[PDB]
Amino acid sequence: EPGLPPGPLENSSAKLVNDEAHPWKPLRPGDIRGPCPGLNTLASHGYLPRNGVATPAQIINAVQEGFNFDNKAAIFATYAAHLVDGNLITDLLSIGRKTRLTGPDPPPPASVGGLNEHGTFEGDASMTRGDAFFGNNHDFNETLFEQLVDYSNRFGGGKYNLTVAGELRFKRIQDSIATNPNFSFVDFRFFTAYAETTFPANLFVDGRRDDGQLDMDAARSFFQFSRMPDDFFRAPSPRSVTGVEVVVQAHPMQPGRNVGKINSYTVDPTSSDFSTPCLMYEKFVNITVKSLYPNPTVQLRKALNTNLDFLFQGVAAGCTQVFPYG
Ligand code: HEM
Ligand SMILES: *[C@@H]1O[C@H](CO)[C@@H](O)[C@H](O)[C@H]1NC(C)=O
Ligand SMILES: *[C@@H]1O[C@H](CO)[C@@H](O)[C@H](O)[C@H]1NC(C)=O
Ligand SMILES: *[C@@H]1O[C@H](CO)[C@@H](O)[C@H](O)[C@H]1NC(C)=O
Ligand SMILES: [Mg+2]
């Protein structure tokens, strides 16, 4: 029942993706949008179902076709999200809030909470979304976006680029340390927090230019309105995180968390970091996934095993597959 992960694009050239077949349309009542401007934009152009509920294969196809996200990155991100936020029996994932549209729920402690669920995939120090502690981890936030604009003005000549990314990533960390007593910055989120800052430079820049300089009109169009610029061409080749090394080198951090009070950031030696990427995969499967499904029945175990094989297809060569359910 779970479809096979799509393979890479047969033709990965730049092309018009804001085309007649994929027009932007406003949200209808019930349409779900969430913390990811990429998926949101794909849904609002009909690369994904416009109500924001999709299969993993639909998501992989959409991120490749609409933005030229590369295949391994698409597979890893999509199956990680599906394993912790999606319905494994119906093969459906919400790109935002929890919804009955993903079908009958599995037993607790699984939450099938969509991408909005804090602490499974989604986490703190996002760029244009607030921390979950402050009440809303998914809607566009104007104040946070205006800080992104200010950091683009100060470090990118008015454009968002990897230098801006390195300064803003660290600012959002510092602000969470100072204000969120529950701030968590370990393991999966420690990786995605750096990766996500490269995506506007690598994937929201029109592919005919591909110069890594994102202007603020296009930025607002994607980040707030889920809308491709008029005449938007996708990137001219598959990519995801290239340049993340610049973001890390700007302000190298250790994984850690506040310990129930502000300004109490405490390094966690059990966390993976960029020196142990295989450990991040192993903890995601052995701890995060297994904690949601500690003792699955037969149909759920088979769906878990299938999606865990698919997830491993997106893991970088050199890691070893782990089997929490045999
Ligand atoms: C392949 C499947 C994808 C999944 C499952 C996914 C999921 C998510 C989630 C859950 C977040 C919230 C992260 C957090 O708060 O910890 C996020 C953030 C983000 N995603 Fe995606 N995403 C995907 C692909 C893409 C693509 C193709 C783009 C194209 C640019 C993109 C751009 C972004 C950006 C820029 C952010 C950061 C938003 C912010 O901090 O303001 N994502 N994604
Ligand atoms: C947006 O973010 C600001 C700054 O962190 C916060 O004070 C505010 O409550 C957030 N929510 C809005 C503006 O709806
Ligand atoms: C970002 O833009 C600023 C100003 O144009 C420039 O000095 C810096 O080199 C740029 N960084 C990248 C990674 O393009
Ligand atoms: C994950 O579990 C496998 C056995 O299922 C084990 O070999 C591996 O060391 C574990 N990794 C962890 C706990 O990080
Ligand atoms: Mg977040």
Alpha-carbon separation of residue 43 from 37, 94, 128, 279 (angstroms): 10, 11, 19, 33
Q: Please work out whether the CB of residue 276 comes within 6 Å of at least one atom of ligand 4.
A: no
- 70 CB less than 6 Å from ligand 4? no
Domain 37-313 grouped into CATH 1.10.540.10: no
Q: What is the Cα–Cα distance from 116 to 113, expressed in whole angstroms?
A: 7
Shortest-distance atom of ligand 3 to CA 162: 13
Whether 250 and 173 have beta carbons less than 8 Å apart is answered as no
Where are the chain's structural domains?
A: 37-313
Residues measured by CB to lie within 5 Å of ligand 5, the ion: 122, 126
How far are the Cα atoms of 88, 91, 111, 152 from residue 104, in angstroms, in the given order?
10, 11, 11, 45
Q: How far is the CA of 302 from the centre of ligand 4 (A)?
A: 20
Q: Is 278 annotated as a binding residue?
A: no
Q: Whose CA is nearest to atom 7 of ligand 2?
A: 143
Angle formed by the axes of helices 216-225 and 142-155, to 10°? Answer: 160
Query: Which ligand minimizes its atom distance to the CA of 139?
Result: 2
C-beta neighbour count of 20 within 10 angstroms: 6
Residue 298 CA to ligand 1 centre (angstroms): 32
Residue 56 contacts residue 86 (beta carbons within 8 Å): yes
Q: Is the CB of 272 under 6 A from ligand 3?
A: no
The tokens describing 87, both together, are 């319905």
Q: Of 22, 56, 36, 26, which Cα lies nearest the Cα of 97?
A: 36
Query: What is the C-alpha to C-alpha distance for residues 79 and 72, in angstroms, rounded to an integer?
Result: 11
To test the ligand 3 pocket, which listed residue (152, 153, 155, 167) has its Cβ within 8 A of the most ligand atoms? 155
Q: What resolution in Å is listed for this PDB structure?
A: 1.6
Tell how far the Cα of 246 is from the centroid of ligand 3, in angstroms: 11
